[PDB]
Design a protein around this ligand. Structure first.
Ligand SMILES: [Zn+2]
Ligand SMILES: [Zn+2]
Ligand SMILES: [Zn+2]
Ligand SMILES: [Zn+2]
Ligand SMILES: [Zn+2]
Ligand SMILES: [Zn+2]
Ligand SMILES: [Zn+2]
Ligand SMILES: [Zn+2]
Ligand SMILES: [Zn+2]
Ligand SMILES: [Zn+2]
Ligand SMILES: [Zn+2]
Ligand SMILES: [Zn+2]
Ligand SMILES: [Zn+2]
Ligand SMILES: [Zn+2]
Ligand SMILES: [Zn+2]
Ligand SMILES: [Zn+2]
Lengths: 66, 50, 67, 50, 66, 50, 67, 50
């Protein structure tokens, strides 16, 4: 596989590559913080997407019933 | 530079996620209003059928 | 991979191959691709800025020495 | 949603690009002016050897 | 006046009467707390009433326009 | 007794007022949704007029 | 007012006179009035409870003494 | 709103009244039983004086 699994695998790749590169740990700690934010964001975006879609279906339904 | 870009991305996504937590609550309320309205409109259409 | 640029380019290919296979609209894909390309150009510019900034300072010193 | 997010990302990435281009144009101009001075000053040193 | 002025005047009356009566101060302090709560409630009830009325008018309007 | 009655009234009105502060925010959101919908429906009715 | 009861009864009259004059529906007024009357009956009962509770305890002691 | 508030108040005041009535009925019954004992015990003391 899904969007989430591919993005975890790519994060895992990138993180390894940068460690081999000697990347300063403050930059790596920041990237780790960003990764967490992006994973959290995906869960919240999906909640919002599902609720939004149901809201719009209900608005349509209520316009037909009124 | 790339450092400053990352700090800014962190702030933006942090802010966006807090907006989405608030929007979840709004949308939950929107749904309760909508379902309540659905029930009222359905009942009224059922009344006209007789 | 040789470099971060090559890794990002590979990771982007994988992602485009995934979205195409799950079936994402042409417009959304076309949007994501131009974004990708701007991000590639932006990193190139960030690098060149860093390099030109150091070179400028060395020329300032060179010019003071030659005067 | 994600569509509006992509529009927003586009806006920010494009503004960033415009700014980076302006900065790069000015830096290239700075470098050109400084290299002119370098060539002038080198030529004067060479003339002093003759 | 209005409802609010009459209720303040009645509170002022009652409070005086109970003071003449020797009413224990813990009971009077509680009544004072209740009075404040009721005044606060009136302001909140009026906000709610006005917003509720506008919400219902808008729902009606949107049912007519759809 | 009358003492206990007063304590209970205090709690009830305290709780009710906090519900009304929350409901104010909900209703404010309800209004933003409704006005947005009004604007959309009006625009669509104006389109059908041509 | 002579008493709290008389004050409350007066304050209620004033309030009913006000609502009637501002023009409140018959049903709402009829609701408020039965509420008022239940509150009057409730205070009377609260009082009688207090009095009967003390009397009961004095009879318990009286009966123990007479036995 | 205030209509639903009055319905709720009615419910609570009426439940309170029911409870106060039950308590008052039991207390009156307690008192009747205790007064019967008082009259019995007094009569026995009077008989002991004769
Ligand atoms: Zn992860
Ligand atoms: Zn998910
Ligand atoms: Zn950048
Ligand atoms: Zn909403
Ligand atoms: Zn590079
Ligand atoms: Zn590319
Ligand atoms: Zn978003
Ligand atoms: Zn210049
Ligand atoms: Zn006051
Ligand atoms: Zn007011
Ligand atoms: Zn009571
Ligand atoms: Zn609402
Ligand atoms: Zn009394
Ligand atoms: Zn009365
Ligand atoms: Zn209320
Ligand atoms: Zn019994």
């Amino acid at each position: 596989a899904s969007i989430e699994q591919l993005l975890e695998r790519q994060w895992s790749e990138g993180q390894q590559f940068l460690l081999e590169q000697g990347t300063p740990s403050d930059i790596l700690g920041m990237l780790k913080s960003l990764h967490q934010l992006q994973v959290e964001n995906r869960r919240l975006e999906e909640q919002i997407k599902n609720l939004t879609a149901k809201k719009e279906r209900l608005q349509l339904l209520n316009a037909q019933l009124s | 530079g790339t450092y400053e870009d990352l700090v800014q991305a962190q702030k933006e996504i942090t802010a966006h996620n807090m907006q989405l937590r608030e929007q979840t609550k709004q949308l939950e309320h929107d749904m309760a209003e909508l379902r309540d309205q659905s029930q009222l409109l359905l009942k009224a259409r059922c009344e006209e059928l007789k």
